[PDB]
């Protein structure tokens, strides 16, 4: 079988398998952003790292350089749409300063919860896995969805599910359809 689809690796494993400070930080992350499973934080780390390699290579370059101009512009435009970067920092240097804390805060969980759409950072993660939320024109069943600043406007519940005006689910139906 010949196949030309590309390879991926989303995360990375630490040089040091056990170190307290790191493990503790990672569990503070898992705690606050309501993750499971350390690799989730690792793949976020990976993502950030990519961003930073980009900014670094671009800072190698002359400020006049066409490539730094175009690609730098592209990187920052790319930040705003995700709202990783505030209005005021459009300089490449501020990319490097990116916190995992900011980047996880762009999660769909982090978004749904902090939108008063869910009681708990955990309530959230079921909800968006329960098929209960729409983002933009789609129905997002994925917790790891990085949120478009622009789609933050339309986050509301699925017209499909209850909370969306749709039929009450199998539970309420089975409870209610048994009389007396």
């Amino acid at each position: 079988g010949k196949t030309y689809i590309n390879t991926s690796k989303t995360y990375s494993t630490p040089r040091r398998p056990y170190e307290k400070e790191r493990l503790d930080n990672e569990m503070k992350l898992i705690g606050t952003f309501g993750l499971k499973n350390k690799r989730e934080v690792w793949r976020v780390q990976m993502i950030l790292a990519k961003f930073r390699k980009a900014a670094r290579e671009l800072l190698t370059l002359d400020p006049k350089d066409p490539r730094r101009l175009f690609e730098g512009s592209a990187l920052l435009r790319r930040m705003f749409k995700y709202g990783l970067l505030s209005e005021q920092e459009r300089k490449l240097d501020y990319v490097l300063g990116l916190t995992i804390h900011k980047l996880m805060e762009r999660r769909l969980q982090t978004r749904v919860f902090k939108l008063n759409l869910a009681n708990s950072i955990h309530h959230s993660r079921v909800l968006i896995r329960q098929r209960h939320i729409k983002v933009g024109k789609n129905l997002v069943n994925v917790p790891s969805f990085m949120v478009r600043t622009d789609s933050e406007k339309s986050i509301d519940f699925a017209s499909t599910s209850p909370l969306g005006g749709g039929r009450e689910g199998r539970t309420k139906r089975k409870n209610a359809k048994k009389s007396a």
Partner: protein
Amino acid sequence: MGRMHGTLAKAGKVRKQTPKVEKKDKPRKTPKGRSYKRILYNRRYAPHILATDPKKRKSPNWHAGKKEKMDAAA
């Protein structure tokens, strides 16, 4: 050193000797998945634990037995 019964060098000796003790039947169960790491965060990295003296923070396995869970809750 005059206590000897079994032949030295017999193969399964210590394992055969060991009494069979049955694993306790658990009331309910241990949550799988995310919920477990929630549980861990709670009993470990949660705000109240952090608030306490970091040098006086209590080590995760300190209690094997339940009498010190009774002494811990009081």
